[PDB]
Design a protein around this ligand. Structure first.
Ligand code: CYC
Lengths: 162, 172, 162, 172, 162, 172, 162, 172, 172, 162, 172, 162
């Protein structure tokens, strides 16, 4: 799973090489950034329920036809899967924050994303809109480098979905 | 490959959960101890050739059978293969120590290695001894750096030992 | 040439990928370490003439037979090449310090090292001893993380020669 | 591949010299400004799809010949190859911006590219125009970030422009 | 471009081989099917204007929100590009019919389809619905093997979009 | 690879014989029924995506454990691998239906596949269930085509089922 | 074994692909040709004994030295192996006719042909003469497309022997 | 690769048009004549070895300098390479005859071939002569098959000649 | 690969010794007899096609089941594979005869070969019989050459037999 | 072209290696054998006309039907080409003798042999018989190691034709 | 690859001739002188490292610009590449000396080498000088063996010089 | 293991080929050289003790510092390993002489040589000097081609150490 630390190890290993000062300075960058990252993760974890609820409701505000009979935002099961999915994204964002890299998102959401969404008729636009709403809300919960960290991973997702 | 953070995430995902307070607090302490961890990795890297060479000298003084005709560290070709193996194992142990996780050592080095040695007729306990000897010399360097801020690295030393001991037990 | 920055770009590039937060945190480690590294480079630069002289003389102290007629430390040309070579090592250590990686040493000293030394009958032991002496001297000029940076690159050379 | 620091080292070595206080002061500038540089690179990466799509929409609105039968962004296969090229160029430009040096862009992307396009019958000025539009949208994102500390990034914006302008001039 | 004839030639050529009775029977199947295929192509060509008009209007009946301000079925240009695109599909269906294979569709629509639609925010949804509408209409225009031909290539497109 | 005709030839050769009347008459009936066979194969090809999608929807409603953390169709990477397998198996089943012989399915798909799944920790009976679910939907399309001449395809339907049923039994 | 059907399946499979209308038209050519092919096979099967007998004797008329003592057409064994071999060829021609391809001939006669004939000192010229004789006889037994089918596979063998 | 139908489609697409009546009528007539086309291709395939061997015998009777020391069809290795080239050209000409289009012959055979021969010192006009001699024997077989329905194949014969003449002109 | 000299060296090294007078004496004899050895190897090489052909003709006169439908030397493809195997084994036997050591035959030919035949359904006893027939014809040629100096080659004939008999015993 | 000398050079070169005593001893074997080999070449060169003439006649002796009208031993041109071809074989045998290897025969006769003979309908049996007859005659012209050399290259050809 | 004997055969074949008395005489002379030739090749092989090193030391004493920053034998990587080239050229020269023919040197070493050096910015006249210094030292060893039978090797020395001089003229 | 015989077998085998006169002449060169080679091996074997003794003592005469306390020629064990190592070289030289190639030296000394010597701090100069002393002594024990053989393998080692 991709983190700064697995990445620098992969680098040294691809060259049959002991880790040197090149890779250790890199690793220090991961460790120095951890405090800001963990502060972001903590804020997203503790506001998770309301961040998910609001995001799901913003999807239905943006695409109102979804909540009509026959549509994919209609019924308890469709709506429960939405909340679950948006909870997944937020969970994997917190993981990436704590991990020091995009690996959790890459491995659990991004690999297979379009194949899966195509087969189950899931529009990336719904998830992009959910994530933009979460981004708006996180902007009042965090500032400074914790905000920069959170935004990086939220934007990463939005891009993966585009 | 996993590291200490990634390992925790994998486990929290199997529970369908955000990381717990408990998981976060052990990751927070790893971050807190990370400079010492970097010094410990740097001790092995900066003294790698020396670590391999002292361990090799000691092995062949203990087990002179290996450097006689009929022995598995004779002729030059076998000695070179042996020394290369010591370097490989020391390299993967040190990767594990940066990672805070043994998975890279298990996956890319130890997996199937005893079986390979048994097929070759390489004495697996002599390889284990070589790993043991490298642990002792490597730990000596971790404990004796030049001009590093003084403090207590016993936990990191214990952790380094586990990776070496892992390798030795997997091979022997 | 290997630096943290070229190595994270190489990583992203090998995967056909934009740089993400993984690589940017790594890069920050390079930038955050630069101050200590530049302090080390400056001390080694300003002390270079005496560090070189003392290092060359220590080689002769450790291997006295070298300065006898017919030997490879005898005569002004042999001794001038020694001082030149040791200045090369110190120059490339300072470059590596400033560069944020082992690249300068790898590309200019380490690649071809054994083949060159074997052909011209240069003992690695002479250079190891020169570098150990320089390391002793640097230990009284620098402390803290500048020292840790200097020592890393001096030890890197000693290992490449072993 | 070179970066800004590596470029200076190469030049100092050709003189047989330790780096000058001028060269070192120049590199100290880059370290000091590096957080802004990371935000600037982050602006491009975090908005890459949109830079490519905004640029693409504008190109094909201006040059409707390209999306007609006979045009070089028709049929779907040619449009896909076109969009892929925009992504590749934007990717190498952003590498250059982290590096502080255009050599990765030149060596791994621009070298021989005009000749490739001429052989294919791809209109090189239209590719150059795509690069210009991506510059504009990319620079807009560098200047309009969310919750970043307010300051002056005009030097880094000018530098980013030079890398885009390098690509366009090399292709056109 | 894939047709029965180019396919059997590619087959013989990949084995360094003269065409034999195996490939000539195959080619006969192409030639025997041409009459039915060309009858299908003729019916689709002559009703192309009304097939396109009706298909575009069915997209808007099925997804009414599209024709609201700010949406992708709003305005002369959005709607002109729809009619053009649906006309492309029908044109390449007729080409495939006449060509004795999926080659025209493969080379001009299928290759690059998802990459293009993703970048320009084009829902496969819309095109699937346009094609289903066309299929309904063609069902009253053709029967027998001309119908079976037309349906094959329409369904091919629907599958490529799924 | 064998087809129905080729299978008969191989058997007649092992007897050192020209094909018998009996063998020739089975092959004559297959030729007679071949237009229906082409419609049946066409029903699967023309509806492939929907056959996989309908089967997948049903499987994950019946076994919700697969789409939870810890389940073998979680995360997105495992769901994508799962859907890809469904397409592969459906593709080889339809090849077998054109050939009138299961050998292509057996040789290029089913051979060693259970063992692969067992090594991966993929629940083999859930893969079998998926195959059966695809059979049901695939047969529905064979029986519900658009403007085909009405007649009896019960024999071809049974044959199609055997190919799907062999796949499921080989995997489970 | 190569037939139209195994060949179109191999084609679709080599591209990771469902059979489409391209391959199904090809397969129809196989099925449509089966009647003519089976009529050819029946005629060759029912006249097999006299076709073989006359072919073997024509070899001896064309190369009379073969039936002299010490030669390869001398004796009941040499002559029994001749009738067997010619019956082989005729049997594999009927198999190819019925199979919709050259596969039976390719797999059982053509693969290894020259190496085998070289080792056992079998002249291709004997077999070419036997096959030309059979072709003459078949010309009075069949007409139209059954003849065209029979001739194709007879000529295929003559070519493989040249 | 293109065939006659595919060639028309590519041209109609450059106009942004459905195929015209005129284009459709020329394709209809190719379909009408396609049985004769299949007989003509079958005449070359069924007699390929003899077409090559007849052409070869005549070439080396007209140009005895090729089969002397110093000549380009001497020693055995050069004669073998020569015969192989005759085979290859005949194979691509017959592909073009099934396709109704010379593009496979041009793309996979003729493109750059004269240049290859000139680099090798192979006399290009002698290769051209070999192609002409194969044309003559090949056309003889097209005109004299066993038990084919009698009719006029002059158009297909002329078309076959164009493909041979195109090879010869490209090489000479 | 080893030869007779190399075999002795490997054994002397395991003892940590210079070669003994006994070992040197055996190698001196081999050198003395080496011209006869070269004639013996020459007898097989110069008559290789005949040895394989005489052996093949005898095998299939003895075991007529192998050349009937259902037999393992039927059809042409199996007969060709069979003849190729006879050639391979005779080649490795003759290499062993130049070397004065069976290791090349065991390492590059016989190792795992019986298992390969058993998996294929090739009758291993019939392969062994082929080898025995090749031995008889090969030894005939070693004994009955054109214009070689007359003398006693019984030892070399016995040695050649051991290499053939080792092949047969390893396969059967 | 394969000789002992080109062989040992190829060997050293494939390993990036200077020639050592291993290859030099081998080369000495070539040089020591040259006297016997050149004596054989001399005898075959000076008897070439009568060796060729007798060999051609022995082919017609063995296969009398060849000299009948319509056959491949009939007429001045067929017979001239025979004498030419047999001269080629003898010439390349002398070249191989002098060269210290099979290279001349390999490069000029053996490469392409079967393909060429198959296309022009040349039986290897004719050439095998010509070569056996030459071998009979050479047996009275040479003895000892010159004979052994001559025989080796004659047998080499017989084998290449089998 | 050609040797002296093979070169003659190629020329005789272009005339359609058996080798002449004159050609056979040259070749007889080469055989006669072959033991000296083996000693001359052995002089280069046995002293290869010293030849390269003596030449290298002289080159860099003469051309001290090459071992300064900016010079083409600086840094260690360029020096190693340089030494490697000297060894490569000396290896192909010695191969040509065993062969009695320069074709191996020309085909596998000299062909296109000047162009390579010019593209790299390697000073071709300095490479040529290296080759000339190696010639001098190599010829010194040919003339200065230990315990070889005394005689005249002037012809072989002159021939060795031609191979070195071919290399130098081809590179400069 | 490389000898002339394993070399020519490898050559034939790499081409799927029977040994021919090319390889057999080479093999004769090996066999013809054996007498001289075995005479060399015989003289080195019988003088081995005094050759090793004198070679070790010459190392100490050339590099006198080695026998001082703390140096690598000091003490019973360092000096016993020297005599053992020099005895190995002489043993493998005799093996190579008898074997007809460099194979014993290649396989047992040359493969891994630099890596081993680098790790245990063994200077090639010591061994070169020992070998040069042995070469001097062998020059009075052998003459002619036995001497040329002995010198070839001694020089081979000196070069492998350079
Ligand atoms: C122009 C680019 C915009 C802008 C930039 C700007 N940034 C800062 C300050 C900081 N930016 C960072 C960002 C990073 N640190 C990292 O390690 C990484 C990779 C994970 C990033 C992206 C940091 C740590 C700082 C310092 C602390 C802070 O939050 O301020 C400034 C302030 C001046 C400075 O150089 O520090 C400025 C001006 N400013 C703009 O207005 C442009 C839109």
């Amino acid at each position: 799973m991709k983190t700064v630390i697995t990445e620098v190890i992969a680098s040294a290993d691809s060259q049959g090489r002991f880790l040197n000062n090149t890779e250790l300075q890199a690793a220090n960058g991961r460790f120095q950034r951890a405090t800001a990252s963990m502060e972001a993760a903590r804020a997203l974890t503790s506001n998770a329920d309301s961040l998910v609820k609001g995001a799901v409701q913003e999807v239905y505000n943006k695409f109102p036809y979804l909540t009509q009979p026959g549509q994919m935002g209609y019924g308890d099961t469709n709506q429960a899967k939405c909340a679950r999915d948006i909870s997944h994204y937020l969970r994997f964002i917190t993981y990436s924050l704590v991990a020091g890299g995009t690996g959790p998102l890459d491995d659990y959401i991004v690999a297979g994303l379009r194949e899966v969404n195509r087969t189950f008729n899931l529009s990336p636009s719904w998830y992009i809109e959910a994530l933009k709403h979460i981004k708006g809300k996180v902007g009042s919960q965090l500032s400074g480098q914790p905000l920069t960290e959170a935004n990086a991973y939220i934007d990463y997702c939005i891009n993966a979905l585009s | 490959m996993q590291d200490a953070f990634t390992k925790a995430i994998v486990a929290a995902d199997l529970r369908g959960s955000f990381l717990s307070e408990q998981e976060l607090n052990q990751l927070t302490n790893l971050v807190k101890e990370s400079n010492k961890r970097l010094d410990a990795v740097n001790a092995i890297t900066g003294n790698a050739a020396e670590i391999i060479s002292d361990a090799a000298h000691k092995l062949f003084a203990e087990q002179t059978d290996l450097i006689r005709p009929g022995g598995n560290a004779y002729p030059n070709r076998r000695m070179a293969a042996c020394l290369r193996d010591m370097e490989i194992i020391l390299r993967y142990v040190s990767y594990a120590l940066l990672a805070g996780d043994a998975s890279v050592l298990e996956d890319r080095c130890l997996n199937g290695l005893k079986e390979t040695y048994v097929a070759l007729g390489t004495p697996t306990r002599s390889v284990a001894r070589a790993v043991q000897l490298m642990k002792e010399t490597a730990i000596g360097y971790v404990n004796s750096p030049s001009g590093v801020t003084r403090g207590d690295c016993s936990a990191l030393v214990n952790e380094a030992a586990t990776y070496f001991d892992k390798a030795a037990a997997s091979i022997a």
